[PDB]
Design an enzyme around this catalytic site. Structure first.
Site, PDB file in Angstrom:
ATOM      1  CG  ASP A 215      24.153  46.228  42.376  1.00  0.00           C
ATOM      2  OD1 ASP A 215      24.989  46.005  43.279  1.00  0.00           O
ATOM      3  OD2 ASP A 215      24.166  45.584  41.316  1.00  0.00           O
TER       4      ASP A 215
ATOM      5  CG  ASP B  48      28.587  38.768  38.816  1.00  0.00           C
ATOM      6  OD1 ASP B  48      29.320  39.589  38.212  1.00  0.00           O
ATOM      7  OD2 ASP B  48      28.590  38.654  40.051  1.00  0.00           O
TER       8      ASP B  48
ATOM      9  CG  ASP C 271      31.108  45.228  41.098  1.00  0.00           C
ATOM     10  OD1 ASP C 271      30.023  45.015  40.530  1.00  0.00           O
ATOM     11  OD2 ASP C 271      31.654  44.392  41.847  1.00  0.00           O
TER      12      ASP C 271
END
Ligand SMILES: OC[C@H]1O[C@H](O[C@H]2[C@H](O)[C@@H](O)[C@@H](O[C@H]3[C@H](O)[C@@H](O)[C@@H](O[C@H]4[C@H](O)[C@@H](O)[C@@H](O[C@H]5[C@H](O)[C@@H](O)[C@@H](O)O[C@@H]5CO)O[C@@H]4CO)O[C@@H]3CO)O[C@@H]2CO)[C@H](O)[C@@H](O)[C@@H]1O
Ligand SMILES: OC[C@H]1O[C@H](OC[C@H]2O[C@H](O[C@H]3[C@H](O)[C@@H](O)[C@@H](O[C@H]4[C@H](O)[C@@H](O)[C@H](O)O[C@@H]4CO)O[C@@H]3CO)[C@H](O)[C@@H](O)[C@@H]2O)[C@H](O)[C@@H](O)[C@@H]1O
Ligand SMILES: OC[C@H]1O[C@H](O[C@H]2[C@H](O)[C@@H](O)[C@@H](O[C@H]3[C@H](O)[C@@H](O)[C@@H](O[C@H]4[C@H](O)[C@@H](O)[C@@H](O)O[C@@H]4CO)O[C@@H]3CO)O[C@@H]2CO)[C@H](O)[C@@H](O)[C@@H]1O
Ligand SMILES: OC[C@H]1O[C@H](O[C@H]2[C@H](O)[C@@H](O)[C@@H](O[C@H]3[C@H](O)[C@@H](O)[C@@H](O[C@H]4[C@H](O)[C@@H](O)[C@@H](O)O[C@@H]4CO)O[C@@H]3CO)O[C@@H]2CO)[C@H](O)[C@@H](O)[C@@H]1O
Ligand SMILES: OC[C@H]1O[C@H](OC[C@H]2O[C@H](O)[C@H](O)[C@@H](O)[C@@H]2O)[C@H](O)[C@@H](O)[C@@H]1O
Ligand SMILES: OC[C@H]1O[C@@H](O)[C@H](O)[C@@H](O)[C@@H]1O
Ligand SMILES: OC[C@H]1O[C@@H](O)[C@H](O)[C@@H](O)[C@@H]1O
Ligand SMILES: OC[C@H]1O[C@H](O)[C@H](O)[C@@H](O)[C@@H]1O
Ligand SMILES: [Ca+2]
Ligand SMILES: [Ca+2]
Ligand SMILES: [Ca+2]
Ligand SMILES: [Mg+2]
Ligand SMILES: [Mg+2]
Ligand SMILES: [Mg+2]
Ligand SMILES: [Mg+2]
Ligand SMILES: [Mg+2]
Ligand SMILES: [Mg+2]
Ligand SMILES: [Mg+2]
Ligand SMILES: [Mg+2]
Ligand SMILES: [Mg+2]
Ligand code: NI
Ligand code: NI
Lengths: 1247, 474
Positions: free
Chosen positions: A398, A457, A395
């Site tokens: 980015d 998300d 995760d």
């Protein structure tokens, strides 16, 4: 925006002057002036002389002044009020105030244009006067000066150190204070000094005032400020220690505090107090932890010892307070403080639950770009890998988003992070364990290191802006997936169910509908996964029986397709092309494919178009060039057109799925997980095309990189439809891996051969698929399935040479039913070791066995059976019952309890009987479950051998709401007693129509029955148009002026074999203005459909709650209603419906009585009826909770509901109705916090 | 979310964030593709027929691979052929484990008992599933000794050994674990971690990324309503025990506005007054008017002063002035204007976080310099509510800032404490007229244009004019 009118009366009395002002009505305005002190005037403007509203908490409620003895002179114009410090003049025509010093100097005045009015005060003053007050500056603002000479900032408390209020004053000798909850002061350098109530400010407004109460101060700044304090209050004296130095601290315990205090004292640095942040209290814990000393940090605060010891060192203690309570503890349990606050209404209005964080950590990003960094990262991951982390969910590779920290990772960060795990794991395991990862970004090259992509998300909603605008929802996801495919990253997934909601993690889960549709969608995407926010649950059973069963059903389809799918995993290692692709890959020259995203290809041979619309009754589906076969319903479609596709919005069982002609689709038995056992027979479904097609079947170990050096197995399968035969080639086995597959069963659709040949040899014919499957060595058989004629061919897999098989001739099966052996079906139960079982220990069974262990509560078997159209299907159950007496099992269809079956003793366990029951099936897939439902009174205790499902129904039904609507025809739920999810209305304009696609097995005359409402009071007409033929008149009488009454219009029609169109339209000669619900079709006379037995309106509470129903409610006079209808998805975990989307609830936090009732007139009086319902109770045990049947001719019948937490079935049978009507109901008497859920209520005619 | 077509595109080629994908790859169903080797950059298309790509300026995400040459690939063929050629140049995908074609349940908020119960629920119902993915729950994130790589055995006791792996494998369940590309550099006890020392000494941090304060343990909360008498009674009742055991001053924070994700709720203008009233009325009743109330809040509206509350200036910056180190919070030099603005609204019982609260990087950011600290203390000593504060685990004791800060702080503190009887008379004055310990010069000189906006000096009581040195190197 107009000023006051003329003074028409003036009454002096002591220090008060009361003015009556003309407003052109009999209720004149009132202006009350009160001289409070020599230098303080109160003014109260009361529009139309109405009583003043209560003053806001600005005003000191105990404020009190001595008599002033002001001189009030009303004898002339202006009226004059004087003290030794000020002179107030009020001009009469119109009323305008001027404020002066006692010496006559003008301070401020109301201009001609207007002063006081209904929404504020307006003054003029010296343009060079310096103004103060109004506002300060917060810790996020540019900080100005003291002057307020050109101000329009609102008057508010604000945030982060701000201060403000309706208080504007000048060093030129005056001040103005307005009582108000927020508002809008205005100043400018032309000399304006104004204040407006205005619109509701950002902070809200809870004190509204119809009058305008204000205060005028005269004097120097200190006198102005003293007057302000007289009005709004003086400050109580703080403790003297508060003039001392104070050390506020966050991150502090008792040892550190003691050390700090010693440090000050040793140095003679004075200090009087320490203020303790979160550290002092058990914030986050149950039992009022946010008020309780944290004795881990401060042990001596277990008693008064800490206080007393600190006092002895001259230290007082201050504690931080937050104006909120913890509603969930660190274990996700509702807290006592929550229950207390919630039950008493102590939450701030408009403020819902939200997520806080209060425990910081310090972190810093790693650099995956460096080889040495990657080595280190991997080395420290080895222990977690050894202990079970075999997939890496990488995760936030980015962007960082935390306060001032807004850092970007570079474009290769996902690739390099992936490379760290890939290189590391491959080296550590000697290429023996395949790498799996996911990341939430992709850039070219990242795919070399074995990573998928997930869409981040995303929002728990149908589409962007449905519930909130800041994240896309479900409907956007196909566009993201296919855009990723267009970038060479086809290994894509999404958070099925959504991640984000309004309110963060405490916000709602998906509705059962959104959840179900999302699962059907996700099952046809590459990386199939649910996810949710913190402490959210995504298990399918939490969303009710439809979500559970529909999710299970589509998951079975996906797992049956493992061998098909896995070939695409192999393909991605050779070309990068994966399991999904947009239509434009296959149709580069088709303009209707150019931007098409509502459907896509799942492998080469399946086009899928999931139902993604809320309450969607039909779909428009573009099918590109070719011939397409409906996977679930069997009919064919020519390509190059947009088809109208009916879907059942009531059952949610449809996943529109189309086989591309040419398809060769390997498939297998459904496993719980991929390597649960060896699969020795692989089915290959073949839909031959006139051009040769092929599919290369592929196996390897599923686990290592051995495939890279040749350790795999493949066999090229190819097929072609010829002039009067079908040829299928099973190529020679290739590669060094020994596959598990021992035989293929070819299912060649479209021809039932008279011979099957291979290499100069006619293969041995067997009587049916079962006999073929039981044979050792090769053979063939034939039959019928949903698609039509089929030829089965069993052959050895993994031969060293090619086998060419040819099916010739045509000898169609006479079979009228499909047989489903239940030992091949889905076995379930309450726990993993109490599922229904397979056995062979009694003789006389068909196939390879039968199902037993239907004798522990909850045991069940579920068959997935396809139907070509919706309607009545008499389904035969073969069973044994050697118990000595009758036994019961529930039959459920598409998550609805259809019947309790009474299965008679068959004389012995080795003797078998049959029971046939008419089931309401829907077009496409149906979920048929036989279950020991002890909570519905079933006994269980039988063995089941198979079911037989007719290829054709006894009578068919087509929902109007799912038909092709045109000319303004629409769907609605705004009348009662419709069937299915809706009905059709707005047949008002000429050209309005509903066009049904009706299927017939043979050319001939069929009976039609059209269910319609006509509440106009008079006969109305439509036209019937069959296959585009000449219109015929449909004359539709009205039973009266009531749109809740439905009738049948019967007629006949001449139909052709296959698809027919039957339209009901308002042609120009017709009157229209009727509602349509359903078209029934039969070769025989039409009788009541199995789907239409329920006499109640909205018995399942599925209607959009904007619209009412035949349900009524009662509660004691003075009590709030405890009753509503919703999905239970706002709760964590969800408390879902029994079926579909919604269920009724009774709930209150405090003691309550509540009922709902529905009265219906029965179709046949002097006859027997039956009430059934699903009920669930939880939380506090009520005094009474029951279903009720009354008004039927006899005395009330009761059925009690007991507090469990689980859905149970309640039945009141043998209702002998002689009154012509029945009242059914549900009633609760609770001392408080009893929750009852009610769903799936049915009243039916009972034998 | 747009469509598939890229016919009028100027969006950059980047990995992006939050599910995005991109690259210098532009192709057509008309039979061609173009792939440029680049670290970000700017593809451009339009309906006049342009098909272009520019390296351009350094993109938002940075650029660590710069190139003087221009390397690109032209593909000819139908879409599947273009895509195959893309995979030849940039690489094909290794085969994933076959279990990864199965259903996967990802979950945040899960321990071993719940995982076992979930798996049982799937297996009992014959709902296929191959994998569970575990969020933060699986690891000791926040702890020393590489906690962000290590199994959390409080949540998953059987992950002490290979047992959990093997029991789950026996049930047909593979386990996936969440990973964050960062390390904890300070554990829960504020100690530097082993993983910090190893990364720092080897240069393993992402270039340009400094450490920063983050949160990961959520709690669910909801605002109380102080406007209701019954609510105030309840709030006070539950505070009595804390008061008995030594909390004699109420630091009432966040009575102004909520700011958490989508939750952006305002409290009303009387929220501070009413919160203050709950404690004031309660404490006066409970102690029979025997113990004076002290409170602070970070907002003020007229009337709140009736309930014995001061005002502090909120989460101000550790800097000399706004924009010195960062632009998003004021510093020390702005504070006199805030104090004196509060005085002009009738709230002269004002204070500030001496030393400042906020820094770049949050709590892990720098403390005030000794100079800033010393001058801020001298300033604070001539303000009404004299208090130091700082961010989480920051320290404000004067001896930590060196001997000048220690001795100069001590000295001015001695001056303040010597003036106790002078000061205390103004505390009494505020109970009579609301006028307090400070006032701007314009209160005494209402007609002086030089005093009209003057905030660099103020009156401390009636008889002292103070003008603290607030400039760096002044
Ligand atoms: O002469 C040089 C001068 O001219 C210009 O300003 C003038 C305005 O253009 C002119 O309209 C006038 O302004 C009046 C206004 O017409 C009048 O309605 C009133 O405004 C009130 C609102 O009535 C009141 O509701 C409240 O508005 C709130 C609103 O309720 C709320 O919902 C939210 O939207 O915010 C609003 C406030 O921002 O308050 C306003 C006052 O702020 O009074 C106005 C002032 O008399 O006269 C202006 C000059 O006096 C130039 O723009 C200006 O720069 C020049 O100096
Ligand atoms: O009718 C008055 C009622 O209206 C609003 O709630 C309506 C709401 O009521 C029901 O929800 C109940 C649940 O059935 C209870 O189980 C309980 O839920 C809690 C649960 O026990 C905890 O384990 C879980 O983790 O947390 C929830 C609380 O969030 O309480 C709720 C009511 O809050 C019904 O099932 C729902 O369909 C329906 O929407 C209003 O919110 C209530 O305050 C009010 O009393
Ligand atoms: O369609 C939108 C409407 O939805 C809701 O209407 C409900 C009503 O709330 C129910 O009361 C009921 O209405 C019946 C009504 O009870 C019955 O008497 C009859 O009313 C006739 C009436 O006898 C006649 O004289 C004339 O006035 O026309 C009436 C109807 O055309 O029939 C009604 C049903 O047709 O059921 C409806 C839903 O069908 C909502 O409350 C309405 O405001 C809304 O318009
Ligand atoms: O035909 C229609 C349009 O054509 C013309 O636009 C040209 C420009 O003149 C060229 O300079 C070029 O634009 C590039 C640019 O050269 C390149 O650096 C890059 O710009 C980045 C920039 O580097 C980056 O730092 C940041 O600021 O973002 C910029 C991108 O938005 O990419 C540009 C292309 O997007 O090519 C275009 C198109 O051919 C004409 O001037 C236009 O007015 C006309 O509409
Ligand atoms: O209850 C129906 C059941 O009856 C017989 O079996 C009874 C009993 O026999 C063994 O002890 C099994 O282990 C149990 O599961 C059974 O309940 C019939 O033999 C059986 O076929 C039937 O299902
Ligand atoms: O780790 C908690 C959450 O962090 C987010 O950044 C991820 O996108 C989520 O998938 C994850 O559940
Ligand atoms: O409680 C932690 C922090 O919360 C913020 O809202 C306050 O303004 C700070 O003074 C406090 O230290
Ligand atoms: O005119 C026909 C229409 O009349 C009324 O508005 C009815 O509510 C509606 O159901 C019907 O379609
Ligand atoms: Ca059988
Ligand atoms: Ca209908
Ligand atoms: Ca329902
Ligand atoms: Mg008086
Ligand atoms: Mg001026
Ligand atoms: Mg009004
Ligand atoms: Mg500390
Ligand atoms: Mg000691
Ligand atoms: Mg404790
Ligand atoms: Mg959980
Ligand atoms: Mg177990
Ligand atoms: Mg541990
Ligand atoms: Ni403000
Ligand atoms: Ni982007």
């Amino acid at each position: 925006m107009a000023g006051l009118g003329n003074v028409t009366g003036a009454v002096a009395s002591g220090d008060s002057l009361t003015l009556t002002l003309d407003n052109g009505t009999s209720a004149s305005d009132i202006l009350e002036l009160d001289v409070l002190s020599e230098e303080l005037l109160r003014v109260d403007y009361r529009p139309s002389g109405a009583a003043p509203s209560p003053s806001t908490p600005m005003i000191d409620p105990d404020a009190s002044w001595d008599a002033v003895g002001a001189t009030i002179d009303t004898s002339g114009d202006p009226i004059v009020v004087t003290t030794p410090r000020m002179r107030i003049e009020i001009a009469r025509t119109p009323a305008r105030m001027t404020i002066k010093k006692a010496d006559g100097t003008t301070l401020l005045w109301e201009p001609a244009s207007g002063g006081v009015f209904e929404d504020g005060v307006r003054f003029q003053r010296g343009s060079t006067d310096n103004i103060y007050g109004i506002r300060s500056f917060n810790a996020q603002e540019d900080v100005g000066g003291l002057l307020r000479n050109s101000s329009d900032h609102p008057a508010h408390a604000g945030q982060q150190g701000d201060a403000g209020g309706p208080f504007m004053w000048s060093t030129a000798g005056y001040g103005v204070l307005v009582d108000s909850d927020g508002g809008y002061p205005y100043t400018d350098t032309t000399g304006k000094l104004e204040f407006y109530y205005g619109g509701t400010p950002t902070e809200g407004r809870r004190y509204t005032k119809t009058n305008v109460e204000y205060y005028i101060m005269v004097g120097e700044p200190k006198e102005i400020m003293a007057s302000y304090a007289q009005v709004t209050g003086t400050a109580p004296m703080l403790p003297k220690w508060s003039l001392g130095f104070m050390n506020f601290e966050w991150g502090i315990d008792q040892d550190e505090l003691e050390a700090h205090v010693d440090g000050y004292r040793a140095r003679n640095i004075p200090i009087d107090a320490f203020a303790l942040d979160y550290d002092w209290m058990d914030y986050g814990e149950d039992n009022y932890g946010e008020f309780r000393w944290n004795t881990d940090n401060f042990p001596d605060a277990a008693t008064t010892q800490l206080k007393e010891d600190m006092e002895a060192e001259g230290i007082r203690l201050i504690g931080i307070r937050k104006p909120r309570i913890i509603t969930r503890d660190f274990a996700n349990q509702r807290t006592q403080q929550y229950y207390d606050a919630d039950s008493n209404g102590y939450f701030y209005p408009g403020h819902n639950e939200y997520t806080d964080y209060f425990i910081p950590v310090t972190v810093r990003s790693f650099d995956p770009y460096q080889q040495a960094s990657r080595d280190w990262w991997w080395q420290h991951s080895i222990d977690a890998f050894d202990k079970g982390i075999v997939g890496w969910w990488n995760d936030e590779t980015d962007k960082v988003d935390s306060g001032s920290a807004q850092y970007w990772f570079g474009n290769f960060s996902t690739g390099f992070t992936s490379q760290a795990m890939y290189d590391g794991q491959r080296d550590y395991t000697n290429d023996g364990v395949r790498v799996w990862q996911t990341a939430r970004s992709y850039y070219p090259g990242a795919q070399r290191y074995a990573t998928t992509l997930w869409s981040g998300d995303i929002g728990t909603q149908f589409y962007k802006g449905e519930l909130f605008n800041w994240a896309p929802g479900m409907q956007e996801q196909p566009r993201i997936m296919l855009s990723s495919a267009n970038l060479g990253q086809p290994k894509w997934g999404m958070d099925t169910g959504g991640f984000n909601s309004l309110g963060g993690a405490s916000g709602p889960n998906p509705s059962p509908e959104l959840y179900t549709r999302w699962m059907q969608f996700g099952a046809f995407t590459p990386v199939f996964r649910v996810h949710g926010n913190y402490n959210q649950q995504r298990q399918p059973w939490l969303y009710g029986a439809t979500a559970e069963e529909a999710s299970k059903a589509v998951m079975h389809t996906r797992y049956s397709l493992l061998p098909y799918m896995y070939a695409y995993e192999r393909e991605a290692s050779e070309t990068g092309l994966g399991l999904i692709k947009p239509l434009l890959f296959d149709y580069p020259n088709d303009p209707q494919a150019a931007d098409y995203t509502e459907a896509w290809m799942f492998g080469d041979w399946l086009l899928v178009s999931p139902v993604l619309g809320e309450a969607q009754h039909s779909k428009q589906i573009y099918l590109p060039a070719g011939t397409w076969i409906d996977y679930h319903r069997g009919q064919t479609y020519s390509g190059g057109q947009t088809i109208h596709y009916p879907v059942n919005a009531d059952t949610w069982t449809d996943v529109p799925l189309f086989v591309k002609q040419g398809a060769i689709i390997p498939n297998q038995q459904v496993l719980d997980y991929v390597d649960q056992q060896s699969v020795t027979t692989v089915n290959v479904d073949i839909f031959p095309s006139a051009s040769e097609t092929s599919f290369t079947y592929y196996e390897d170990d599923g686990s290592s990189y051995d495939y890279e050096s040749g350790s795999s197995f493949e066999q090229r399968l190819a097929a072609q439809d010829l002039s009067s035969s079908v040829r299928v080639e099973v190529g020679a086995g290739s590669g060094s891996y020994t596959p598990d597959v021992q035989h293929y069963v070819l299912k060649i659709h479209g021809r039932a051969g008279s011979a099957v040949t291979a290499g100069g040899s006619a293969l041995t014919g067997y009587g049916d698929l079962q006999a073929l499957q039981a044979a050792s060595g090769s053979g063939w058989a034939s039959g019928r399935d949903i698609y039509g004629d089929v030829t089965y061919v069993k052959l050895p897999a993994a031969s060293g040479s090619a086998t060419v098989v040819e099916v010739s001739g045509s000898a169609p099966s006479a079979a009228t039913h499909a047989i489903y052996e239940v030992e091949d079906a889905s076995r379930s139960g309450a726990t993993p070791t109490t599922r229904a079982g397979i056995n062979t220990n009694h003789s006389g069974y068909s196939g390879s066995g039968f199902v037993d262990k239907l004798d522990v509560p909850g045991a069940a078997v579920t068959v997935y059976a396809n139907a070509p159209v919706s309607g009545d299907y008499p389904v035969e159950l073969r069973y044994a019952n050697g118990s000595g007496s009758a036994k019961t099992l529930s039959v459920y269809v598409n998550a609805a309890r259809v019947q309790q079956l009474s299965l008679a003793d068959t004389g012995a366990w080795s003797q078998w009987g049959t029971q046939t029951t008419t089931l309401p099936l829907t077009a496409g897939q149906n979920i048929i479950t036989y279950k020991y439902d002890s909570d519905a009174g079933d006994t269980g205790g039988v063995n089941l051998d198979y079911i037989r499902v007719p290829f054709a129904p006894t009578q068919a039904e087509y929902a109007a709401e799912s038909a092709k609507l045109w000319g303004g025809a629409g769907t609605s739920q705004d009348h009662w007693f419709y069937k299915g999810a809706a009905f059709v209305d707005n047949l008002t304009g000429v050209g309005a129509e509903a066009s049904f696609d009706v299927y017939a097995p043979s050319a001939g005359t069929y009976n039609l029955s059209l269910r319609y409402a006509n509440g106009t009071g008079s006969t109305k007409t439509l036209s019937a148009i069959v296959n585009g033929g000449a219109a015929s008149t449909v004359t539709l009488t009205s039973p009266g002026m009531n749109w809740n009454l439905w009738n049948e219009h019967t007629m006949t029609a001449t139909l052709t074999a296959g698809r027919n169109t039957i339209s009901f339209r308002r042609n120009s000669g017709n009157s229209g203005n009727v509602n349509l619900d359903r078209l029934a079709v039969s070769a025989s006379a039409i009788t009541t459909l199995a789907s239409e037995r329920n006499l109640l309106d909205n018995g399942d509470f599925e209607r959009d709650t904007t619209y009412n129903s035949n349900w009524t409610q009662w509660q004691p006079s003075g009590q709030p209603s405890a009753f509503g209808i919703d999905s239970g998805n706002a709760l964590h975990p969800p408390e879902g419906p029994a079926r579909r989307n919604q269920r009724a609830y009774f709930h209150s936090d405090n003691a309550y009585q509540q009922s709902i009732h529905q009265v219906v007139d029965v179709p046949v009086n002097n006859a027997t009826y039956r009430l059934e319902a699903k009920v669930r109770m939880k939380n506090t045990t009520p005094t009474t909770a029951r279903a009720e049947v009354q008004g039927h001719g006899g005395s009330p019948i009761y059925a009690n509901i007991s507090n469990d937490g689980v859905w149970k079935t309640i039945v009141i049978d043998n209702i002998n109705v002689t009154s012509g009507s029945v009242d059914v109901g549900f009633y609760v008497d609770s001392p408080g916090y009893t929750t009852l859920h009610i769903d799936e209520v049915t009243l039916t005619r009972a034998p």
